[PDB]
DNA sequence: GCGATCGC
DNA sequence: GCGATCGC
């Protein structure tokens, strides 16, 4: 599957793209909130760390229209 | 500070 | 409402 290995708070995590619910730029960063068992998780990773697939996630995001 | 959110 | 949070 694609993983998305990121740190929050120390909690260095690798969550499933599937689980990501919203993706977006920050910066050069790629930012993105997923689910966290129930709870809404933060993540973000710098664009050289972010799989294709979150890329690809983040420009589908990018051509949202209102 | 940028986006966007959580968690308070 | 805003600090923390991420990368930078």
Known sequence: ???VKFKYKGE???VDTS???KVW???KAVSFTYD???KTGRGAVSEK???KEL???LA????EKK
């Open 12 to 14: 260095e995590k690798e």
């Open 36 to 38: 966290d068992n129930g």
């Open 19 to 21: 689980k990501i619910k």
């Open 25 to 27: 730029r920050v910066g």
């Open 1 to 3: 599957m694609v993983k």
């Open 55 to 57: 890329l690809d996630m």
């Open 49 to 51: 760390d972010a799989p």
């Open 60 to 63: 589908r995001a990018e051509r």
